[PDB]
């Protein structure tokens, strides 16, 4: 019982693009760009589509960097998040009713205003490591337990 999601991080040598979600699930936290994968769509095509819908950017080749499975206690569906990065985009990040984008220097990633698991795996993404993670949450703030391991093949 799992549902597919994508997450794209635009990660350049000295800065990363994040978006502040304004409403809905995850609102109030900085995040990459992503969402649910659609019927008849590959995961990578879904990742590219979500980047455009949410940020206004067009991506040239996505790299698989991780997979994170989220369990929220008391919710039946696990969230199977496929994480991608890119360093080459076209377009200017667009603020909309759903998302406020901002570039961050790597030393200033706003972990206090992100989902708490990001503090664990974002540093691997910054060092160009690939990973498989699992995080069990109670509510949206408490990690009850987790696993996180580096892998050679996502
Ligand atoms: N960067 C990041 N960390 C997260 N932690 C827990 C959940 C989610 C999440 C957000 C939106 N849709 C699905 C999800 F699984 C996270 N996204």
């Amino acid at each position: 019982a799992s549902r597919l999601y994508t997450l794209v991080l635009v990660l350049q040598p000295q800065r990363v693009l994040l978006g502040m979600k304004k409403r809905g699930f995850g609102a109030g936290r900085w995040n990459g760009f992503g969402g649910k994968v659609q019927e008849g769509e590959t995961i990578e095509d879904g990742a590219r589509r979500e980047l455009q819908e949410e940020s206004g950017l067009t991506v040239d080749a996505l790299h698989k960097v991780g997979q994170i499975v989220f369990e929220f206690v008391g919710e039946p569906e696990l969230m199977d998040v496929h994480v991608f990065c890119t360093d080459s985009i076209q377009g200017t990040p667009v603020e909309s009713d759903e998302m406020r984008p901002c570039w961050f220097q790597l030393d200033q990633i706003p972990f206090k205003d992100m989902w708490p698991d990001d503090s664990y795996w974002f540093p691997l993404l910054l060092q160009k490591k690939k990973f498989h993670g699992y995080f069990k949450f109670q509510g949206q703030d408490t990690i009850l337990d987790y696993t996180l391991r580096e892998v050679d093949t996502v």
Side-chain angles (χ1 to χ4, degrees), residues 7 9 16 21 37 45 53 63 69 83 89 92 101 105-106 127 129 135 144-145 148-149 151:
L7 180 61
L9 281 309
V16 64
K21 189 138 163 58
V37 178
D45 289 335
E53 296 190 9
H63 300 282
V69 174
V83 188
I89 55 132
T92 304
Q105 299 295 292
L106 301 191
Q127 287 183 348
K129 301 303 191 175
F135 292 83
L144 299 174
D145 51 70
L148 180 61
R149 79 163 192 284
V151 300

Side-chain angles (χ1 to χ4, degrees), residues 1-22 24-59 61-107 109-111 113-127 129 131-150:
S2 71
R3 180 83 185 259
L4 286 169
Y5 295 78
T6 61
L7 180 61
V8 176
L9 281 309
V10 182
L11 177 57
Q12 294 185 341
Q14 289 303 328
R15 65 177 189 177
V16 64
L17 183 66
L18 299 168
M20 168 61 61
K21 189 138 163 58
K22 301 187 187 185
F25 185 74
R29 277 161 169 177
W30 295 101
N31 205 341
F33 305 101
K36 289 167 183 169
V37 178
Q38 292 172 9
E39 294 149 349
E41 181 176 61
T42 67
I43 295 169
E44 181 181 343
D45 289 335
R48 181 173 306 111
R49 170 186 52 78
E50 294 283 351
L51 182 69
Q52 162 62 54
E53 296 190 9
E54 300 192 343
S55 77
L57 301 176
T58 301
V59 52
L62 285 168
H63 300 282
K64 290 174 289 190
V65 299
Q67 180 184 27
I68 313 169
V69 174
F70 295 108
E71 176 191 347
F72 291 88
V73 293
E75 301 187 5
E77 206 66 9
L78 303 176
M79 301 181 182
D80 176 9
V81 182
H82 291 247
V83 188
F84 297 84
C85 75
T86 181
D87 66 358
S88 53
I89 55 132
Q90 297 169 92
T92 304
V94 187
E95 171 165 15
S96 65
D97 66 325
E98 302 282 357
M99 192 74 50
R100 177 170 60 96
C102 205
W103 286 105
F104 290 85
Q105 299 295 292
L106 301 191
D107 277 1
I109 289 163
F111 287 114
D113 295 324
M114 292 163 78
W115 285 89
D117 54 288
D118 297 27
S119 295
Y120 289 95
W121 55 264
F122 222 93
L124 308 181
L125 185 141
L126 296 181
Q127 287 183 348
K129 301 303 191 175
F131 54 87
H132 281 180
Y134 162 79
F135 292 83
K136 180 178 172 196
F137 271 82
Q138 184 173 239
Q140 299 192 352
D141 302 330
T142 305
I143 299 167
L144 299 174
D145 51 70
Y146 81 101
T147 62
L148 180 61
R149 79 163 192 284
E150 294 181 21

